[PDB]
Ligand binder design. Structure first.
Ligand SMILES: NC(=O)c1ccc[n+]([C@@H]2O[C@H](COP(=O)([O-])OP(=O)(O)OC[C@H]3O[C@@H](n4cnc5c(N)ncnc54)[C@H](O)[C@@H]3O)[C@@H](O)[C@H]2O)c1
Ligand SMILES: NC(=O)c1ccc[n+]([C@@H]2O[C@H](COP(=O)([O-])OP(=O)(O)OC[C@H]3O[C@@H](n4cnc5c(N)ncnc54)[C@H](O)[C@@H]3O)[C@@H](O)[C@H]2O)c1
Ligand SMILES: NC(=O)c1ccc[n+]([C@@H]2O[C@H](COP(=O)([O-])OP(=O)(O)OC[C@H]3O[C@@H](n4cnc5c(N)ncnc54)[C@H](O)[C@@H]3O)[C@@H](O)[C@H]2O)c1
Ligand SMILES: NC(=O)c1ccc[n+]([C@@H]2O[C@H](COP(=O)([O-])OP(=O)(O)OC[C@H]3O[C@@H](n4cnc5c(N)ncnc54)[C@H](O)[C@@H]3O)[C@@H](O)[C@H]2O)c1
Lengths: 255, 254, 255, 255
């Protein structure tokens, strides 16, 4: 027994209707995993579930009842071995802008979806995973969350997003410590800039220009490359309590 | 050579107790005028009276309270400093005996410590941006309190660690946001300090904890946190950084 | 198309006669890679090269001419696509001991083997890789070095080792920036505690107790688990300029 | 009772003939401390030591005998309470240049002066401070070293400098741990960009342009501002085992 098996195990992916979550769903399905997609986007989520043979659950990650429903769907499908938190939003607003201070509700909403939502999915999924029998490598399950390089390199306009993502990154260690007796590993990925619908409203010129600023490779990341690192986290028993930058070595500048 | 504390106004959240109180005392001794913003009327009004400053009852999570506290400061004089010390430190495991960590406890910790700190920053920064620059160039300086839990989160600290990591992580983008306004933004990450936050931890356990600090082998004094605040106000090159103030301790899981 | 191929490409592994380097050589060889092992240990290195169908070079990583010889053996064998720096030593001595200060030569030697030696191998290998045609994914090659959690969590007695490994970790970014125009990715792994001959002086009992301190899994790392991460680095085109802790979420205490 | 006294105590400052070391010397003297300046620069060191009423010792920080002489001069002068490591060099060379790889000697020399040299001074000064009676605040002494933002943000051409300064940063914690029983605090300052002779051969336009990149204040740091932070570290009993960026919030880009 060298690593946790993806084949025939269940993986709950928030934000699974789009972008990195969708790419993760595709790779885990190709590996024989069974996916539960938890997202607000019912049309895309149901469609992807049909394409992959998974289950779609309409889920606002910030709500207790929705996290419960998503986790219960996964445990009904089979043995829940992985949570991948990809649900997130990335608004921009300066601390002091042209119209006065950053609106409070905008900061709160960003924190609520990205940080409180991620914790909400973690706590519910962890409670369920703790009831599993250990796999042959010892794990009851593995939790992967998505931060961002903004946790470390926050740009002008990203105070809220950075706060939320640094929150996600910072809680990796205490959660790993909390769940060590349950044999659940806890990891975070901090992506740089990836080609997903999160970038809709960045004109194609500006996207290509941003790709060109990445040291190597000089392009936006593919969702599959995120997914590849998720799989490695699942498969490597020693990866725990850590945040991994996945960013072509970029360091984001103020603008 | 540096921004003068003397004669300028300093808004200190959590200023009725502990680190905020200590900061208030030192800033007053340096000739600053303090506004103490806290939930605690009785302790806040006493200390403000003692220091010849002003107390404002302020829940840092509330927009209207933030506005009132900043307004008190701009009335008193030129607002040159915000020090965010308001915060709470609950303990609860991700998965407890009785089920998962309660969601509301997590949300409450995040709301006081992170959303509250941001709420004070945004309002205070808007007011500071209207100031004329001091002779050293600053319109103002914002200092926030994270914790070594931002980096060394222990068992039961997921909510506190998330909140404090948030505070630490936003230091840089807020510094970047306010660089055109000539406002510096810094964060102190304290280790373990002797304040009422340790009420409940019995004395033997506090002494044992002090003995785990490499040097000095004791709990931090509020004046020591306040010394670092004062350096941040006085040093024109400190911006966009998080400083651990912890006697070199690194917190273990338990 | 999706990642750099290990099969039929050449991998130069310093410290390849033992422990993490040897485990990396085994995994890369299983994946069809051709290995050059570079090590001081002639007997073990030659025996492992023979077993894996690779090449051994007796090489002190601190010497220019040894790095040159190791790189020349690799380029003879085929297309040099990866360097893995595992050559290292881990002495212990306090800054101020019972008998006086930490000896200067012990500090210097640690830094020379672990930090100067790693850079020596990198610069020579990178110069070779820079002359490669790019692979389909765009990389001319990929460099992986070994730091340690001691870069961040240095214990009493570890000033020299910590300095050296923090140096390895900190140079990852500028070297990735230097080699971005050459399309060479540069990454660092920071292992926690792994079961290798580096632990020879630690009694079995103290190894087992230290294993029990690792949050999860409560054991020492396997060389294969280090190797798995090296493979991920090679295969993921977005991993660049980063240091990855591989440590079961442990944080090292002073003692 | 609140903090260690600078007045009438002795401070050993390496690189004290120029720039940050010189500014430190001035500020500590103005506060009533007695300085020993340790530097290669005999003429400027002797002249400044005279100007400040202290002592100069020609000291190559990489040599054991020089460290010993410099520490001896300090303990003859009075009670040695602080060491400030400012001796350093910052050459530039790419990992792979136009003409071949980065010369090995250039990397080794940078590491030798900046890292080995800083450790050499620490171990000798620490052994001498360990023999002091504690000050009323409890310290026998305090050690301050100079890293750089290049420890974290290393630029193209800075592999050697970044390695050296990340080494200095990363050894802060184990050395603090080593010296805790001796009551000696150990700290590091990581400066951004400061107006000193280190920038000689950067033309004034390039210096002014780089100052304009500092988010706030939009200028180069003054040596006095470095020195102010050194004094805070001496006077704050709770600052230990930590690295402090002093940089106007800049993050250095590849070029
Ligand atoms: N694309 C990038 O460049 C990038 C870089 C760094 C980090 N990230 C983060 O990666 C993660 C994935 O984002 P992405 O690029 O795939 O963006 P995306 O917009 O394509 O996908 C995000 C998904 O999250 C869903 N979602 C939003 N709020 C939700 C909520 N309350 N409950 C449930 N689902 C919700 C959305 O409907 C969407 O389907 C996010 O956390 C994002 O912040 C992205
Ligand atoms: N004492 C320590 O060991 C330690 C260590 C690291 C960080 N901290 C942090 O330092 C800061 C100050 O803590 P302290 O030790 O002085 O604790 P404390 O309990 O003595 O003081 C905190 C103050 O915050 C006030 N407060 C709580 N919620 C508030 C709200 N919504 N609005 C306004 N005021 C509110 C309290 O009434 C109190 O007066 C906190 O952010 C704390 O998390 C403390
Ligand atoms: N084992 C652990 O717990 C652990 C943890 C963190 C980091 N590391 C690091 O991992 C790497 C591999 O260590 P390991 O555990 O496999 O130890 P190991 O002692 O089994 O293997 C180290 C190899 O490096 C060789 N070597 C030493 N100096 C050399 C030199 N100048 N030139 C060429 N070869 C040299 C040795 O002969 C040996 O074969 C090292 O850099 C080590 O510092 C190990
Ligand atoms: N100026 C900056 O922008 C900047 C930024 C970050 C870090 N630093 C670092 O600050 C420290 C001070 O640099 P500075 O700006 O004052 O430069 P500087 O060149 O003005 O002063 C450095 C001093 O170090 C002495 N020195 C060099 N090698 C020595 C050796 N082997 N032994 C003894 N002394 C030696 C020099 O003769 C010189 O007087 C260095 O460690 C430097 O790398 C400087």
């Amino acid at each position: 027994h060298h690593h946790m098996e993806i084949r025939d195990n269940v993986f709950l992916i928030t934000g699974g209707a789009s972008g990195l979550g969708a790419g993760t769903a595709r790779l885990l399905t190709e590996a024989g995993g069974k996916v539960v997609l938890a997202d607000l986007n019912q049309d895309a989520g149901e469609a992807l579930a049909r394409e992959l043979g998974g289950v779609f659950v309409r889920c606002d990650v910030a709500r207790e009842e929705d996290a419960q429903a998503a986790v219960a769907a996964a445990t009904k499908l089979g043995t829940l071995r992985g949570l991948v938190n990809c649900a997130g939003i990335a608004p921009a607003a300066k601390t002091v802008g042209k119209d006065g201070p950053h609106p409070l509700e905008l900061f709160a909403k960003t924190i609520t979806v990205n940080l409180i939502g991620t914790f909400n999915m973690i706590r519910v999924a962890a409670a369920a995973m703790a009831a599993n029998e250990p796999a042959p490598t010892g794990e009851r399950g593995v939790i992967v969350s998505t931060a961002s390089v903004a946790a470390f390199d926050g740009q002008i306009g990203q105070a809220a997003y950075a706060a939320s993502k640094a929150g996600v990154a910072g809680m990796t260690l205490p959660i790993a410590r909390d769940l060590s007796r349950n044999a659940i590993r806890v990891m975070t990925i901090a992506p740089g800039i990836f080609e997903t619908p999160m970038l809709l409203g960045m004109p194609q010129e500006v996207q290509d220009a941003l790709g060109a600023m990445v040291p190597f490779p000089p392009r936006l990341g593919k969702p599959a490359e995120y997914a590849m690192l998720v799989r490695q986290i699942f498969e490597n028993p020693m990866l725990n309590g850590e945040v991994i930058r996945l960013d072509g070595a970029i360091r984001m500048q103020p603008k």
